[PDB]
Design a protein around this ligand. Structure first.
Ligand SMILES: O[C@H]1[C@H](NCc2cnc3ccccc3c2)[C@H]2CO[C@H](O2)[C@@H]1N1CCOCC1
Ligand SMILES: O[C@H]1[C@H](NCc2cnc3ccccc3c2)[C@H]2CO[C@H](O2)[C@@H]1N1CCOCC1
Length: 330
């Protein structure tokens, strides 16, 4: 089997991407944030505190003839931005782009934090990291991909995120028309439950490539590119007037500045992020100071190849017995 769905930026800055997902019988379609950095499928629901729902589409398990309450099961998650959510658990039928899993754990939110409430376009998350990170207690649950994997034509999914444009998540096959050149595969460590890999180095603009090992995660659920302080300082030094602002919480730059590209290494291959992918616009409406899309990972403790990086590539999440990651230019 295979599945294919379109993923859409939530706003003009590509702050996140949403993908439609069918849950239950009859189907209830929710727009979920596919997140390769976490492993819970959770949704706004009929059980979510009313004051914490503001425009989202909700899952109502009582209207799904295939929903079954998972007795005594609960979940609770926190993310790197201080946001959180929690609730109870159902199993139900979930479909993505024609690919159907029966008995998928659907984590119904009783509570969500303010950032979630404030984003009306995101109805929940669909985790695609390793199932070892799933938070359901007292019995941990499997991701949509883990549940689907044995039925897929090939045990893979791909992320093709657009810059200010539509994109695609495919399950079970590699669309060889979606990229240029070859896909370079690189080793993955699952020891932290992430799609964790080691980049071979970087360049800034037309500068010389610096060979250096950068361990980080391929994370579709993180907006920006988080890299070591040394690397980030080297990037922003090439932007006139850029500075790190404690008040704003990272590097900012004059909105009229020309941003250089940023290149990262995948083995001997190179993925080039165009400069404009790094522009996250005015820090507040009407300001001529703009937020940067490459930021230090010093505070977070791990390097993150988020959407800024991934949308410059066609990315293969290969869930073979020994998982690997593939990157191609496009
Ligand atoms: O247009 C190309 C697409 N470009 C990015 C993309 C991704 N996702 C998108 C989703 C919706 C609308 C548009 C989308 C566009 C990707 C995905 O498929 C192929 O490469 C496709 N053709 C390549 C040439 O022969 C085959 C067709
Ligand atoms: O990008 C962040 C994610 N939120 C994306 C998001 C969603 N919606 C948004 C809507 C508007 C403007 C911006 C938005 C940003 C979540 C999941 O993990 C973290 O928090 C992640 N990083 C936080 C900073 O360092 C750690 C990694």
């Amino acid at each position: 089997s295979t599945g294919s769905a379109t993923t859409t930026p939530i706003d003009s800055l590509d702050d996140a991407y949403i993908t439609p997902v069918q849950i239950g019988t009859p189907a209830q379609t929710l727009n979920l944030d596919f997140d390769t950095g976490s492993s819970d499928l959770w949704v706004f629901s009929s059980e979510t505190t009313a004051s914490e729902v503001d425009g989202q589409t909700i899952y109502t398990p009582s209207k799904s003839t295939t929903a079954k309450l998972l007795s005594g099961a609960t979940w609770s998650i926190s993310y790197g931005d201080g946001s959180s959510s929690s609730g109870d658990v159902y199993t139900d039928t979930v479909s993505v782009g024609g690919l159907t899993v029966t008995g998928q754990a659907v984590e119904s939110a009783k509570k969500v934090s303010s950032s979630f409430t404030e984003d009306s376009t995101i109805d929940g998350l669909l985790g695609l990291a390793f199932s070892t990170l799933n938070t359901v207690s007292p019995t941990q649950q499997k991701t949509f991909f883990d549940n689907a994997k044995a039925s897929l034509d090939s045990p893979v999914f791909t992320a093709d995120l657009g810059y200010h444009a539509p994109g695609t998540y495919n399950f079970g096959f590699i669309d060889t028309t979606a990229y240029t050149g070859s896909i370079t595969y690189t080793a993955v460590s699952t020891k932290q439950g992430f799609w964790e890999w080691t980049s071979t180095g970087y360049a800034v603009g037309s500068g010389t490539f610096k060979s250096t090992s950068i361990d980080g995660i391929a994370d579709t659920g993180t907006t920006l590119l988080y890299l070591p302080a040394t690397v980030v300082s080297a990037y922003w030094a090439q932007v006139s007037g850029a500075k790190s602002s404690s008040s704003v919480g990272g590097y900012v730059f004059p909105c009229s500045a020309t941003l250089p590209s940023f290149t990262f290494g995948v083995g001997s291959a190179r993925i080039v992020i165009p400069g404009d992918y790094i522009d996250f616009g005015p820090i507040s409406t009407g300001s001529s100071s703009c937020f940067g899309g490459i930021q230090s990972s010093a505070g977070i403790g791990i390097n993150i190849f988020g959407d800024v990086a991934l949308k410059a590539a066609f990315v293969v999440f290969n869930g073979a017995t020994t998982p690997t990651l593939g990157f191609a230019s496009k």
